[PDB]
Amino acid sequence: MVSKGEELFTGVVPILVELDGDVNGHKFSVSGEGEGDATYGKLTLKFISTTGKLPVPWPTLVTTLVQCFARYPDHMKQHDFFKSAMPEGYVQERTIFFKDDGNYKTRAEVKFEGDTLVNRIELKGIDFKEDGNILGHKLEYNYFSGNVYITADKQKNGIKANFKIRHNIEDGGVQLADHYQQNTPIGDGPVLLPDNHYLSEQSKLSKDPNEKRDHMVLLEFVTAAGI
Secondary structure: OOOOOHHHHOOEEEEEEEEEEEEOOEEEEEEEEEEEEOOOOEEEEEEEEOOOOOOOOHHHHOOOOOHHHOEOOHHHHHHOHHHHOOOOOEEEEEEEEEOOOOEEEEEEEEEEEOOEEEEEEEEEEEOOOOOOOOOOOOEOOOEEEEEEEEEEEHHHOEEEEEEEEEEEEOOOOEEEEEEEEEEEEOOOOOOOOOOOEEEEEEEEEEOOOOOOOOEEEEEEEEEEEOO
């Protein structure tokens, strides 16, 4: 049968993202709007800095800026924690360790507000290098992929995940970003606790030619695999 949270994602859902960040005392705010179609694993969003030029590269914020839009194959739908937590939602937390640089710590609440799926985020970055790849804006702006390895956290009625993102540098090298993640339900309601699996994620970054604010247009595909 079709579960409580799964039915909320059968069509196109509007998305609203709000992020408050502070990286080495540079405060910034990002708003995002778009839509998600979990049937296809497809997200289309436009993010805007509401605080002027970002102090960190847009590609470093992509993983932080709604895994409930994953396309789960029919034969894995009993392993979709993210939709099962809806509409009450879940808390997502990460540490993102930038190799030879600082870290981001993030806390996000993902939940429905009426028909709109909302992602509300707090991001704290510390110990970054002034002339590093991040504060120095040395990362390329184009495309990256990731394989998110998800396991159950029975103890917390939730999940954990870890994955590496390789951000291309302007010189031709790579900035590694090592991600550690935990998700816990907001509700006291039951959730689906998964077997080991991965989400295959692809992120295409672009610009709106008519937009003068600092911004990122994002097309994202997210597909569950490995069962």
